[PDB]
Scaffold this active site. Structure first.
Site, PDB file in Angstrom:
ATOM      1  N   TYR A   1     -17.424  23.427  43.155  1.00 31.29           N
ATOM      2  CA  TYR A   1     -16.948  24.679  43.872  1.00 31.29           C
ATOM      3  C   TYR A   1     -15.909  25.664  43.271  1.00 31.29           C
ATOM      4  O   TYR A   1     -15.109  25.062  42.270  1.00 31.29           O
ATOM      5  CB  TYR A   1     -15.475  23.174  44.281  1.00 31.29           C
ATOM      6  CG  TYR A   1     -15.075  23.985  45.730  1.00 31.29           C
ATOM      7  CD1 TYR A   1     -15.707  24.919  46.650  1.00 31.29           C
ATOM      8  CD2 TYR A   1     -13.191  24.011  45.991  1.00 31.29           C
ATOM      9  CE1 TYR A   1     -14.118  24.950  47.826  1.00 31.29           C
ATOM     10  CE2 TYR A   1     -12.216  24.184  46.832  1.00 31.29           C
ATOM     11  CZ  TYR A   1     -12.688  24.825  47.887  1.00 31.29           C
ATOM     12  OH  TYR A   1     -12.265  25.281  48.625  1.00 31.29           O
TER      13      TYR A   1
ATOM     14  N   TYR B   1      -6.594  21.317  45.629  1.00 25.65           N
ATOM     15  CA  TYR B   1      -7.209  20.611  45.462  1.00 25.65           C
ATOM     16  C   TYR B   1      -6.844  19.906  44.081  1.00 25.65           C
ATOM     17  O   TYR B   1      -7.150  20.292  42.606  1.00 25.65           O
ATOM     18  CB  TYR B   1      -8.665  21.994  45.021  1.00 25.65           C
ATOM     19  CG  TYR B   1     -10.097  20.995  44.755  1.00 25.65           C
ATOM     20  CD1 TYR B   1     -10.864  20.983  45.813  1.00 25.65           C
ATOM     21  CD2 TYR B   1     -10.408  21.260  43.249  1.00 25.65           C
ATOM     22  CE1 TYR B   1     -11.984  20.023  45.059  1.00 25.65           C
ATOM     23  CE2 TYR B   1     -12.059  21.186  43.181  1.00 25.65           C
ATOM     24  CZ  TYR B   1     -12.897  20.338  43.978  1.00 25.65           C
ATOM     25  OH  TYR B   1     -13.918  19.977  44.103  1.00 25.65           O
TER      26      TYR B   1
HETATM   27  N1  LIG Z   1     -17.999  18.757  51.098  1.00 23.37           N
HETATM   28  C1  LIG Z   1     -18.001  19.818  50.641  1.00 23.37           C
HETATM   29  O1  LIG Z   1     -17.279  20.623  51.632  1.00 23.37           O
HETATM   30  C2  LIG Z   1     -17.858  20.067  49.356  1.00 23.37           C
HETATM   31  C3  LIG Z   1     -17.959  21.950  48.623  1.00 23.37           C
HETATM   32  C4  LIG Z   1     -18.202  22.120  46.977  1.00 23.37           C
HETATM   33  C5  LIG Z   1     -18.920  20.924  46.595  1.00 23.37           C
HETATM   34  N2  LIG Z   1     -18.803  19.883  47.256  1.00 23.37           N
HETATM   35  C6  LIG Z   1     -19.352  18.861  45.698  1.00 23.37           C
HETATM   36  O2  LIG Z   1     -20.265  18.194  46.767  1.00 23.37           O
HETATM   37  C7  LIG Z   1     -20.668  17.129  45.706  1.00 23.37           C
HETATM   38  C8  LIG Z   1     -20.811  15.925  46.700  1.00 23.37           C
HETATM   39  O3  LIG Z   1     -19.677  15.621  47.250  1.00 23.37           O
HETATM   40  P1  LIG Z   1     -19.268  15.422  49.156  1.00 23.37           P
HETATM   41  O4  LIG Z   1     -18.647  16.395  49.412  1.00 23.37           O
HETATM   42  O5  LIG Z   1     -21.160  15.537  49.821  1.00 23.37           O
HETATM   43  O6  LIG Z   1     -19.234  14.044  49.683  1.00 23.37           O
HETATM   44  P2  LIG Z   1     -20.017  12.565  49.120  1.00 23.37           P
HETATM   45  O7  LIG Z   1     -18.513  12.090  49.814  1.00 23.37           O
HETATM   46  O8  LIG Z   1     -20.706  11.700  50.102  1.00 23.37           O
HETATM   47  O9  LIG Z   1     -20.191  12.678  47.800  1.00 23.37           O
HETATM   48  C9  LIG Z   1     -19.262  12.005  46.569  1.00 23.37           C
HETATM   49  C10 LIG Z   1     -19.978  10.675  46.390  1.00 23.37           C
HETATM   50  O10 LIG Z   1     -20.074  10.337  44.958  1.00 23.37           O
HETATM   51  C11 LIG Z   1     -19.687   8.901  44.828  1.00 23.37           C
HETATM   52  N3  LIG Z   1     -19.268   8.355  43.916  1.00 23.37           N
HETATM   53  C12 LIG Z   1     -17.557   8.268  43.029  1.00 23.37           C
HETATM   54  N4  LIG Z   1     -17.902   8.180  41.876  1.00 23.37           N
HETATM   55  C13 LIG Z   1     -18.600   7.583  41.995  1.00 23.37           C
HETATM   56  C14 LIG Z   1     -19.376   6.896  40.534  1.00 23.37           C
HETATM   57  N5  LIG Z   1     -18.496   6.982  39.462  1.00 23.37           N
HETATM   58  N6  LIG Z   1     -20.615   6.595  39.992  1.00 23.37           N
HETATM   59  C15 LIG Z   1     -21.765   7.432  41.223  1.00 23.37           C
HETATM   60  N7  LIG Z   1     -21.015   7.772  42.969  1.00 23.37           N
HETATM   61  C16 LIG Z   1     -20.162   7.907  42.740  1.00 23.37           C
HETATM   62  C17 LIG Z   1     -19.879   8.403  46.267  1.00 23.37           C
HETATM   63  O11 LIG Z   1     -20.406   7.197  46.707  1.00 23.37           O
HETATM   64  C18 LIG Z   1     -19.844  10.090  47.065  1.00 23.37           C
HETATM   65  O12 LIG Z   1     -21.036   9.373  48.368  1.00 23.37           O
HETATM   66  C19 LIG Z   1     -19.377  16.787  44.629  1.00 23.37           C
HETATM   67  O13 LIG Z   1     -19.222  17.391  43.579  1.00 23.37           O
HETATM   68  C20 LIG Z   1     -18.584  17.892  45.170  1.00 23.37           C
HETATM   69  O14 LIG Z   1     -17.467  18.244  44.274  1.00 23.37           O
HETATM   70  C21 LIG Z   1     -18.831  19.180  47.638  1.00 23.37           C
HETATM   71  O1  LIG Z   2     -12.031  10.436  45.043  1.00 19.34           O
HETATM   72  C1  LIG Z   2     -12.487  12.122  45.222  1.00 19.34           C
HETATM   73  C2  LIG Z   2     -11.198  12.460  45.754  1.00 19.34           C
HETATM   74  C3  LIG Z   2     -11.980  14.368  46.219  1.00 19.34           C
HETATM   75  C4  LIG Z   2     -13.215  14.760  46.386  1.00 19.34           C
HETATM   76  C5  LIG Z   2     -13.854  15.427  47.039  1.00 19.34           C
HETATM   77  C6  LIG Z   2     -14.953  15.720  46.709  1.00 19.34           C
HETATM   78  O2  LIG Z   2     -15.520  17.208  47.031  1.00 19.34           O
HETATM   79  C7  LIG Z   2     -15.501  17.841  47.896  1.00 19.34           C
HETATM   80  C8  LIG Z   2     -14.703  17.906  48.713  1.00 19.34           C
HETATM   81  C9  LIG Z   2     -14.197  19.348  50.239  1.00 19.34           C
HETATM   82  C10 LIG Z   2     -13.945  20.676  49.125  1.00 19.34           C
HETATM   83 CL1  LIG Z   2     -13.555  21.544  50.033  1.00 19.34          CL
HETATM   84  C11 LIG Z   2     -14.967  20.249  47.105  1.00 19.34           C
HETATM   85  C12 LIG Z   2     -15.590  19.068  47.317  1.00 19.34           C
HETATM   86  O3  LIG Z   2     -15.898  19.454  45.936  1.00 19.34           O
HETATM   87  C13 LIG Z   2     -16.286  14.914  46.450  1.00 19.34           C
HETATM   88  C14 LIG Z   2     -15.439  13.403  46.104  1.00 19.34           C
HETATM   89  C15 LIG Z   2     -14.456  13.201  46.080  1.00 19.34           C
HETATM   90  C16 LIG Z   2     -13.761  12.040  45.243  1.00 19.34           C
END
Ligand SMILES: NC(=O)c1ccc[n+]([C@@H]2O[C@H](COP(=O)([O-])OP(=O)(O)OC[C@H]3O[C@@H](n4cnc5c(N)ncnc54)[C@H](O)[C@@H]3O)[C@@H](O)[C@H]2O)c1
Ligand SMILES: Oc1ccc2cc(Oc3ccc(Cl)cc3O)ccc2c1
Ligand SMILES: NC(=O)c1ccc[n+]([C@@H]2O[C@H](COP(=O)([O-])OP(=O)(O)OC[C@H]3O[C@@H](n4cnc5c(N)ncnc54)[C@H](O)[C@@H]3O)[C@@H](O)[C@H]2O)c1
Ligand SMILES: Oc1ccc2cc(Oc3ccc(Cl)cc3O)ccc2c1
Lengths: 60, 229, 60, 229
Positions: D171, D181
Site C-alpha cells: 500500500y 495506518y
Molecule cells: N483492502 C485494502 O484496502 C488494501 C489495500 C492495499 C493493500 N492491501 C493488502 O492486501 C493484503 C490482503 O488484505 P485484505 O485487505 O484483502 O484483507 P484480508 O482481511 O482478506 O487479508 C488479511 C488476511 O491475512 C490473514 N492473516 C493474518 N495474520 C496471518 C498469519 N499470521 N498467517 C496467515 N494468515 C494471516 C487473515 O486470515 C486475513 O484473511 C494485505 O497484504 C494488505 O496489506 C489491502
Molecule cells: O492486524 C491488522 C491490521 C491492519 C490490517 C490491514 C490490512 O490491509 C489494508 C487495509 C486497508 C488499507 Cl488502506 C491498506 C491495507 O494494507 C490487512 C491486514 C491487517 C491486519
C-alpha cells in the site's frame, strides 16, 4: 563497439533475470496495458527491463 | 473489434513491430503510422514479401495489418507543413500525413478505435552530450519525441471509444544518467513520463481513457544502432 | 465513519479514473504478473489504484 | 498445470478472493492458505454453501478450489510453535500449518507449483500511530507482514518450477504518509517493497523466478475495518 551493444551486454550480465530481452516481451506487456484487464492502471511507468532498473552496484 | 493505431514503425526490428505482433495475437486490427521518409521503402519491402516470415504469429496465424499510412508526428495539421518539407521528394507524392489528417483518415475509413501506441523518438543531436546540445536540437527532440504524444491524444481522442487505452515507450535514462543518450533524449523521456501522469488526469477525468508508458530495456533496433557512443 | 470509508470515498472523487476499485481489478493484474506474459518484469511495485498515487493536490 | 498457492484468505471480501477468482478464469488450480483462527469458520461456511455465489466466474465457470489448508505465516518450522498457540482451542486440532510444513504438504500431494501469492498483513497495534507503537507491536507487524514473504520464498523456492512467479500486496502508505495506518504497517510495507527488489535479485539469478508487488487502492475488506482511525 556502439552504445547499444554495451547496454545489451551489460543488461544480460547484471540484470536480475539473465535472459535475452525480446521486442515481444515489451509487446505482451503493451498488449496487457492496452486491454480492459488493466482498467485500474493509468499514469504509470511500467518497467519491462528484466529488472535491471532495481540494481545499484554490479556484481562483477 | 479492437483497432490499434501504432505510430512509429519503419521496419520489423523495433518495439512497434513487437507490439503489433503481440496484439494481432489477440485478434486486434492493426494500423501502422509510417514516417514519410521511409514509407515507400517500407511498402516496397512489404510488397516483395520481405516481412512475410516476421508476420507469422506463433500460433500459425498471419498478422493482419488493416492499413499503413504515411504519418509524421512533427506536424499537427495541414497548415503546419513548411515549404521545405512540402517540396521534399519523400513528402511530395504523399498527402494527409499530419496528426489531424491521419486521425480523420482513420475515422473515415474504419471508424472509432480503442487502442493507440506511441512508439517513436527523434533527436538530431543524440550524439552530443547534454551540455553541447543546441537549443534547436534540444527542442527538436522534445517536439518530435515528447509533444508528439500530447498532440496524438488531443486529436485521436475524438475518434476513440470510452475506456480506450494508450501507451508510449520510454527509457530509464530520464531518471538515472546514461552517458551516450544525449541530444535531449533523456530530457524528452523525462517530459514524456511526467506528461503521461498529467495526461492520465485529463484523459481519465474527461473521457475515461487510460494512458501509461513502458520503460523498456535495450533492444538492437535500427534507431538504437544510430546512437554512436 | 472509519478510515477505509474515507479512503474509498477520497479515491472515487479524486482518482484520475472515477470508478469503484474491485478486488477483481487487482486480481486481473495479479493474474498478468503471475503468468509468463510478464516474463520481463521483476522486482517492481505495480500500482493498481485507478491512478490515485499520481495526484498531489486534490481538485476542489 | 499451473498451481497457485494463495496465502491469506479468510473470507470472500478480500483481495485474495478477487485474485483467486481471476486466476480460475485462466484455469489455474487454486490452493488456499487459511489462518487457523478463522479456518473452521471458513470451512463451515464454504461447506454450508455460503460462498456459492461468490464462486461464480461470469462465464458460468465455477471457481475451482483445489485445496484449503490451515496456514500461519508467523511460524517458519514446527519447532517455532510456542506451547500456548500449540494448545490453543483453534490450533490444537490442526497440524502442518507452519510455512515449512505447507510447502512439504503441497509438494507431497500436488508436486511442484509455479505461482505464489502473499496476500496477508497483521499488526496488533494498528490502532496506534507510529510514534506510540511499541517495539513488540512493531516487530510483530514486520514479522507477520514482511518476513513472512521472505520465509515463504525460502521454503517454496524448492517446490517451484523455473520461471515461476511470486507476488504480494502493498500500500502506498509506505511511500507517502497516511495517518491512521499505524502499528508499523507503513514500516512493514516499506520493508516489503524493498525486500521485493532484493529477492527479485536472489530469486532471479539463482532460480529464474520473478517477484513483484502490487500497490493496491482502498478495498472494504474485513481487515480494512480494523483500521479504527
Ligand atoms: N483492502 C485494502 O484496502 C488494501 C489495500 C492495499 C493493500 N492491501 C493488502 O492486501 C493484503 C490482503 O488484505 P485484505 O485487505 O484483502 O484483507 P484480508 O482481511 O482478506 O487479508 C488479511 C488476511 O491475512 C490473514 N492473516 C493474518 N495474520 C496471518 C498469519 N499470521 N498467517 C496467515 N494468515 C494471516 C487473515 O486470515 C486475513 O484473511 C494485505 O497484504 C494488505 O496489506 C489491502
Ligand atoms: O492486524 C491488522 C491490521 C491492519 C490490517 C490491514 C490490512 O490491509 C489494508 C487495509 C486497508 C488499507 Cl488502506 C491498506 C491495507 O494494507 C490487512 C491486514 C491487517 C491486519
Ligand atoms: N531500442 C531500445 O533499446 C529502446 C529502449 C527503451 C525505449 N525505447 C523507445 O521505443 C520507441 C521506438 O524505438 P525503437 O527503438 O523500437 O526504434 P525504431 O527505430 O523502430 O522506432 C523509431 C521510429 O520513429 C519514427 N520517427 C521519427 N520521427 C518521426 C516522426 N516525426 N513521425 C513519425 N515517425 C517518426 C521512425 O520512422 C522510426 O521507425 C522509442 O520511443 C524509443 O525511445 C527503445
Ligand atoms: O534521432 C534519434 C536518436 C536516438 C533514438 C533512439 C531511439 O530509441 C532508443 C534506443 C536505445 C535506447 Cl538504450 C533508448 C532509446 O530510447 C529511437 C529513436 C531515436 C532517434
Amino acid at each position: 563497439y556502439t552504445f547499444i551493444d554495451y547496454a545489451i551486454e551489460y543488461s544480460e550480465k547484471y540484470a536480475p533475470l539473465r535472459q535475452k530481452l525480446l521486442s515481444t516481451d515489451i509487446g505482451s506487456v503493451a498488449s496487457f496495458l492496452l486491454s480492459r484487464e488493466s482498467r485500474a492502471i493509468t499514469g504509470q511507468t511500467i518497467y519491462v527491463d528484466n529488472g535491471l532498473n532495481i540494481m545499484f552496484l554490479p556484481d562483477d | 473489434e479492437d483497432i490499434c493505431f501504432i505510430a512509429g514503425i519503419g521496419d520489423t526490428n523495433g518495439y512497434g513491430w513487437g507490439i503489433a505482433k503481440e496484439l494481432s495475437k489477440r485478434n486486434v486490427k492493426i494500423i501502422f503510422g509510417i514516417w514519410p521518409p521511409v514509407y515507400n521503402i517500407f511498402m516496397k519491402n512489404y510488397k516483395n514479401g520481405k516481412f512475410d516470415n516476421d508476420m507469422i504469429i506463433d500460433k500459425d496465424k498471419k498478422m493482419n495489418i488493416l492499413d499503413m499510412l504515411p504519418f509524421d508526428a512533427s506536424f499537427d495539421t495541414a497548415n503546419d507543413i513548411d515549404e521545405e518539407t512540402k517540396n521534399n521528394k519523400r513528402y511530395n507524392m504523399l498527402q494527409n500525413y499530419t496528426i489531424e489528417d491521419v486521425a480523420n483518415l482513420i475515422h473515415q475509413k474504419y471508424g472509432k478505435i480503442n487502442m493507440l501506441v506511441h512508439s517513436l523518438a527523434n533527436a538530431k543531436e543524440v550524439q552530443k552530450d547534454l551540455l553541447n546540445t543546441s537549443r534547436k536540437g534540444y527542442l527538436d527532440a522534445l517536439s518530435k519525441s515528447s509533444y508528439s504524444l500530447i498532440s496524438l491524444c488531443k486529436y485521436f481522442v475524438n475518434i476513440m471509444k470510452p475506456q480506450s487505452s494508450i501507451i508510449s515507450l520510454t527509457y530509464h535514462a530520464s531518471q538515472k544518467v546514461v552517458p551516450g543518450y544525449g541530444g535531449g533524449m533523456s530530457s524528452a523521456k523525462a517530459a514524456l513520463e511526467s506528461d503521461t501522469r498529467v495526461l492520465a488526469y485529463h484523459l481519465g477525468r474527461n473521457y475515461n481513457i487510460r494512458i501509461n508508458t513502458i520503460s523498456a530495456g535495450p533492444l538492437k533496433s535500427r534507431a538504437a544502432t544510430a546512437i554512436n557512443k
